[PDB]
Coordinates of C-alpha atoms in Angstrom, one line a residue:
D1 CA -74.5 4.5 -13.7
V2 CA -70.7 4.1 -13.7
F3 CA -70.4 5.3 -10.0
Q4 CA -73.1 2.9 -8.5
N5 CA -72.5 1.8 -4.9
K6 CA -69.7 4.4 -4.4
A7 CA -69.6 7.0 -1.6
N8 CA -66.1 8.4 -1.9
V9 CA -65.2 8.8 -5.6
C10 CA -65.8 12.5 -6.0
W11 CA -62.4 12.6 -7.6
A12 CA -63.4 10.1 -10.3
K13 CA -66.6 12.1 -11.1
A14 CA -64.6 15.4 -11.2
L15 CA -62.1 13.7 -13.7
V16 CA -64.9 12.8 -16.2
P17 CA -64.9 16.2 -18.0
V18 CA -61.1 16.4 -17.9
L19 CA -60.7 13.0 -19.5
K20 CA -63.4 13.7 -22.0
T21 CA -61.1 16.4 -23.6
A22 CA -58.9 13.5 -24.7
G23 CA -61.9 11.4 -25.9
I24 CA -61.8 9.1 -22.8
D25 CA -64.9 7.5 -21.5
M26 CA -64.1 5.2 -18.5
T27 CA -66.5 2.3 -17.9
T28 CA -67.0 0.8 -14.4
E29 CA -64.7 -2.1 -15.2
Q30 CA -61.9 0.4 -16.4
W31 CA -62.4 2.5 -13.3
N32 CA -62.0 -0.7 -11.2
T33 CA -58.3 -0.8 -12.3
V34 CA -57.8 2.2 -10.1
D35 CA -57.3 0.7 -6.6
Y36 CA -59.1 3.4 -4.7
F37 CA -62.1 3.3 -7.0
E38 CA -62.5 -0.5 -6.5
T39 CA -62.1 0.0 -2.7
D40 CA -64.1 3.3 -2.6
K41 CA -61.7 5.6 -0.9
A42 CA -60.9 9.3 -1.1
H43 CA -58.0 10.2 -3.5
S44 CA -56.4 13.0 -5.3
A45 CA -58.0 13.7 -8.7
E46 CA -54.5 15.1 -9.8
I47 CA -52.6 11.9 -8.9
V48 CA -55.3 9.8 -10.7
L49 CA -55.2 12.0 -13.8
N50 CA -51.4 11.5 -13.9
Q51 CA -51.9 7.7 -13.6
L52 CA -54.5 7.6 -16.4
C53 CA -52.4 9.9 -18.6
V54 CA -49.5 7.3 -18.4
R55 CA -51.8 4.3 -18.9
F56 CA -53.6 5.8 -21.9
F57 CA -50.8 7.8 -23.6
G58 CA -47.5 6.6 -22.1
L59 CA -46.7 10.1 -20.8
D60 CA -47.1 11.8 -17.4
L61 CA -48.3 15.3 -16.7
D62 CA -44.8 16.9 -17.1
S63 CA -45.2 16.2 -20.8
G64 CA -47.8 19.0 -20.7
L65 CA -50.4 16.8 -22.4
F66 CA -53.2 17.9 -20.0
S67 CA -51.8 21.4 -19.5
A68 CA -54.6 23.3 -21.3
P69 CA -56.7 25.2 -18.6
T70 CA -60.0 23.8 -19.8
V71 CA -61.7 22.2 -16.8
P72 CA -61.1 22.9 -13.1
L73 CA -60.2 20.3 -10.5
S74 CA -61.1 22.0 -7.2
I75 CA -61.5 20.9 -3.6
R76 CA -64.4 22.3 -1.6
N77 CA -65.3 20.7 1.8
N78 CA -62.6 18.0 1.3
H79 CA -64.4 16.8 -1.9
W80 CA -63.3 17.2 -5.5
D81 CA -65.4 19.0 -8.0
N82 CA -65.2 21.2 -11.1
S83 CA -66.0 24.6 -9.5
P84 CA -64.0 27.5 -10.8
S85 CA -60.5 27.7 -9.5
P86 CA -57.0 28.5 -10.9
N87 CA -56.2 24.7 -11.1
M88 CA -57.3 23.7 -14.6
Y89 CA -56.6 20.8 -16.9
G90 CA -57.4 19.6 -20.3
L91 CA -55.9 18.1 -23.5
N92 CA -53.3 20.6 -24.9
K93 CA -53.6 20.4 -28.7
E94 CA -50.4 22.4 -29.3
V95 CA -48.5 19.8 -27.1
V96 CA -50.2 17.0 -29.1
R97 CA -49.1 18.6 -32.4
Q98 CA -45.5 18.9 -31.0
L99 CA -45.5 15.3 -29.9
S100 CA -47.0 14.0 -33.2
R101 CA -43.6 14.0 -35.0
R102 CA -42.3 11.4 -32.6
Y103 CA -45.7 9.7 -32.0
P104 CA -47.7 9.7 -35.3
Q105 CA -50.9 8.1 -34.0
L106 CA -51.0 10.1 -30.8
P107 CA -53.4 12.7 -32.2
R108 CA -55.8 9.9 -33.1
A109 CA -55.4 8.4 -29.6
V110 CA -56.3 11.7 -27.9
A111 CA -59.2 12.3 -30.4
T112 CA -60.8 8.9 -29.7
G113 CA -59.8 8.0 -26.1
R114 CA -57.7 5.0 -27.2
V115 CA -54.4 3.8 -25.6
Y116 CA -51.3 4.9 -27.5
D117 CA -49.0 1.9 -27.1
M118 CA -45.5 3.3 -26.7
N119 CA -43.9 0.0 -27.8
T120 CA -45.7 -0.3 -31.1
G121 CA -47.1 3.2 -31.9
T122 CA -50.5 1.6 -32.5
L123 CA -53.9 2.2 -30.8
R124 CA -55.5 -0.2 -28.3
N125 CA -58.5 -0.5 -26.0
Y126 CA -57.9 0.4 -22.4
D127 CA -55.6 -2.0 -20.5
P128 CA -53.4 -0.9 -17.6
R129 CA -50.5 -3.3 -18.6
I130 CA -49.7 -1.5 -21.9
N131 CA -47.9 1.6 -20.7
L132 CA -46.2 0.8 -17.4
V133 CA -43.8 3.8 -17.1
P134 CA -44.0 7.4 -18.5
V135 CA -41.5 7.6 -21.4
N136 CA -40.9 11.3 -20.9
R137 CA -39.8 10.9 -17.2
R138 CA -36.2 10.5 -16.3
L139 CA -36.6 8.2 -13.3
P140 CA -34.6 9.5 -10.3
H141 CA -33.5 6.0 -9.2
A142 CA -33.4 2.4 -10.3
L143 CA -36.6 0.2 -10.1
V144 CA -36.4 -3.5 -9.1
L145 CA -35.5 -6.3 -11.5
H146 CA -38.2 -8.7 -10.0
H147 CA -41.1 -8.6 -7.5
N148 CA -42.3 -11.6 -5.4
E149 CA -45.2 -12.2 -3.0
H150 CA -43.8 -12.2 0.6
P151 CA -45.5 -12.1 4.0
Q152 CA -45.9 -8.6 5.5
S153 CA -42.6 -7.2 7.0
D154 CA -42.4 -7.1 10.8
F155 CA -40.8 -3.7 11.8
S156 CA -41.2 -4.1 15.6
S157 CA -37.4 -4.5 16.1
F158 CA -36.6 -1.5 13.9
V159 CA -39.0 0.8 15.6
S160 CA -37.9 -0.4 19.1
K161 CA -34.3 0.7 18.3
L162 CA -35.3 4.3 17.4
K163 CA -34.7 7.0 19.9
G164 CA -37.9 8.3 21.5
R165 CA -40.4 7.6 24.3
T166 CA -43.8 8.1 22.7
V167 CA -44.8 6.3 19.5
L168 CA -47.9 6.6 17.2
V169 CA -48.3 3.6 14.9
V170 CA -50.5 4.4 11.9
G171 CA -52.1 1.6 9.9
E172 CA -51.5 -2.0 10.9
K173 CA -51.0 -3.0 14.6
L174 CA -47.4 -3.0 15.8
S175 CA -46.0 -4.0 19.2
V176 CA -43.0 -1.8 20.1
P177 CA -41.2 -3.2 23.2
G178 CA -39.9 -0.6 25.7
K179 CA -42.0 2.4 24.3
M180 CA -45.4 3.9 24.8
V181 CA -47.6 3.2 21.8
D182 CA -50.8 4.8 20.5
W183 CA -52.5 3.2 17.5
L184 CA -54.3 5.1 14.7
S185 CA -56.3 2.8 12.3
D186 CA -59.9 2.2 11.1
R187 CA -60.3 -0.8 13.5
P188 CA -62.6 -0.7 16.6
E189 CA -59.8 -1.5 19.1
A190 CA -57.5 1.3 17.9
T191 CA -56.6 4.2 20.2
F192 CA -57.8 6.6 17.5
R193 CA -60.4 5.1 15.2
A194 CA -60.7 6.9 11.8
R195 CA -60.8 6.4 8.0
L196 CA -57.1 6.5 7.0
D197 CA -57.9 7.8 3.5
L198 CA -59.0 11.1 5.2
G199 CA -55.5 11.5 6.7
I200 CA -54.4 11.9 10.3
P201 CA -57.2 13.4 12.4
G202 CA -56.4 16.9 13.6
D203 CA -57.4 15.9 17.1
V204 CA -54.5 13.3 17.3
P205 CA -51.8 14.7 19.7
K206 CA -47.9 14.9 19.3
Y207 CA -45.3 12.1 19.5
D208 CA -41.6 11.5 19.6
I209 CA -41.9 8.8 16.8
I210 CA -44.7 8.3 14.2
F211 CA -44.5 5.1 12.2
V212 CA -46.6 4.9 9.0
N213 CA -47.2 1.1 8.9
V214 CA -49.3 1.2 5.7
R215 CA -48.7 -0.9 2.6
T216 CA -49.8 -0.6 -1.1
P217 CA -50.3 -3.7 -3.3
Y218 CA -48.1 -4.5 -6.2
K219 CA -50.2 -5.2 -9.3
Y220 CA -48.4 -4.3 -12.6
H221 CA -45.0 -2.7 -11.9
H222 CA -42.9 -0.9 -9.3
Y223 CA -44.0 2.4 -10.9
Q224 CA -47.7 1.5 -10.3
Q225 CA -47.0 0.5 -6.7
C226 CA -45.2 3.7 -6.0
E227 CA -47.9 6.0 -7.6
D228 CA -50.7 4.1 -5.8
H229 CA -48.8 4.7 -2.5
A230 CA -48.3 8.5 -3.2
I231 CA -51.7 9.5 -1.7
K232 CA -50.8 7.7 1.5
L233 CA -47.5 9.6 1.8
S234 CA -49.5 12.8 1.4
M235 CA -52.4 12.0 3.7
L236 CA -50.4 10.1 6.4
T237 CA -46.7 10.6 6.2
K238 CA -46.7 14.4 5.3
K239 CA -49.6 15.1 7.8
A240 CA -47.6 13.3 10.5
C241 CA -45.1 16.1 10.5
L242 CA -47.7 18.3 12.3
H243 CA -48.0 15.6 15.1
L244 CA -44.3 15.5 16.1
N245 CA -42.6 17.0 19.1
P246 CA -39.6 19.2 18.3
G247 CA -36.8 16.9 17.2
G248 CA -39.2 14.0 16.6
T249 CA -39.0 11.2 14.0
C250 CA -41.3 10.0 11.2
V251 CA -40.6 6.6 9.6
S252 CA -42.8 5.5 6.7
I253 CA -43.2 2.4 4.5
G254 CA -42.5 3.4 0.9
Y255 CA -41.5 2.2 -2.5
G256 CA -39.2 5.1 -3.5
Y257 CA -40.5 7.9 -5.7
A258 CA -40.7 6.5 -9.2
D259 CA -43.6 8.9 -9.9
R260 CA -43.7 12.7 -9.9
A261 CA -46.1 13.0 -6.9
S262 CA -44.1 10.8 -4.6
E263 CA -40.9 12.6 -5.5
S264 CA -42.5 16.0 -4.7
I265 CA -44.1 14.7 -1.4
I266 CA -40.9 13.1 -0.1
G267 CA -39.0 16.3 -0.9
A268 CA -41.5 18.4 1.0
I269 CA -41.3 16.1 4.0
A270 CA -37.5 15.8 4.0
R271 CA -37.1 19.6 4.2
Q272 CA -38.8 19.6 7.6
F273 CA -36.1 17.4 9.2
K274 CA -32.4 17.6 10.2
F275 CA -31.8 14.2 8.7
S276 CA -33.5 12.0 6.1
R277 CA -32.4 8.5 4.9
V278 CA -33.8 5.3 3.3
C279 CA -33.4 1.9 5.0
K280 CA -34.2 -1.6 4.0
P281 CA -33.9 -3.7 7.2
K282 CA -33.4 -7.5 7.0
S283 CA -37.1 -7.9 8.0
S284 CA -38.2 -6.1 4.9
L285 CA -38.8 -8.9 2.4
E286 CA -41.0 -7.4 -0.4
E287 CA -38.4 -6.3 -3.0
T288 CA -39.9 -2.9 -3.7
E289 CA -40.4 -2.0 0.0
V290 CA -38.2 0.5 1.9
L291 CA -38.5 2.7 5.0
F292 CA -38.2 6.4 4.6
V293 CA -36.6 7.7 7.9
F294 CA -37.0 11.3 8.8
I295 CA -35.2 12.3 12.1
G296 CA -35.0 15.7 13.9
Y297 CA -38.3 17.5 13.1
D298 CA -38.1 21.3 13.1
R299 CA -39.3 24.2 10.9
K300 CA -35.9 25.6 10.1
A301 CA -35.6 26.7 6.5
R302 CA -33.4 24.2 4.6
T303 CA -32.9 22.7 1.1
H304 CA -33.1 19.0 0.4
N305 CA -30.8 17.3 -2.1
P306 CA -33.0 14.5 -3.6
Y307 CA -29.8 12.9 -5.1
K308 CA -28.9 11.7 -1.6
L309 CA -32.1 9.6 -1.2
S310 CA -32.1 8.6 -4.9
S311 CA -28.5 7.3 -4.6
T312 CA -29.5 5.1 -1.6
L313 CA -32.7 3.9 -3.5
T314 CA -30.6 2.9 -6.5
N315 CA -28.2 1.1 -4.2
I316 CA -31.0 -0.8 -2.5
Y317 CA -32.9 -1.8 -5.6
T318 CA -29.8 -2.9 -7.6
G319 CA -28.0 -4.6 -4.7
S320 CA -25.2 -2.0 -4.9

């Protein structure tokens, strides 16, 4: 049993028939290379499909590789399953045929569940290091030249300088001098105790400032770190917008939006604020780490130009 000792991996189970359309059969060891499988947390099946699509075939979902409406990925009672819905995925053989001119062994890869190595064009057994970025994606900003292991960044000073009376800290504990602080975490001494993989509880009230003090480990590449953090932007940072007073602020740890999910999520968040920016304070040591800063919450209809944040991200990550 591949899913032994797991309570929260409905998403992985729902992916099995989607992945089988490309010949893929994930072992427990291979599933353990997905962080939320190893730690047994709730996740988006769609984000994980995109991750596995890149790892196996060097292409993300915007390639159309899994765009055949073969198998549903549906959510019922906050759990993923394959019940009928208009959200269907599967290997698209016409897309495979189109891609085969540029990638001659790709049809064999998707027939047999083997990694198509984008550097060599040859087929490999599963290894998450082979394809680190999707070759079809024009990255919206620069990624970092090098990553190092630093201590966790202390953002107490940054948050204390923000305008606002009432603060909700989500994730790790943070003292904020001069402000009122509530704490949301899965620790016994938190103000609101809850599993953070299930998002902000609807019973949490409204605040002037919400700080998402949640980090994602770097393993293989900036891209990987960003795509692994995407679900946290969706479940925490985006949900936080419903817990803000009019004109309130949301600040979130992030790593840019190297992946398609993060880009979409950040765009959706940014549209609900008068102002959005990216900051990397002196206290932020980890090279890939930034703060997304969203100021002046409302529900006025407005567009967001992602080139603004992308310009800043490129500047931060290239020292420009």
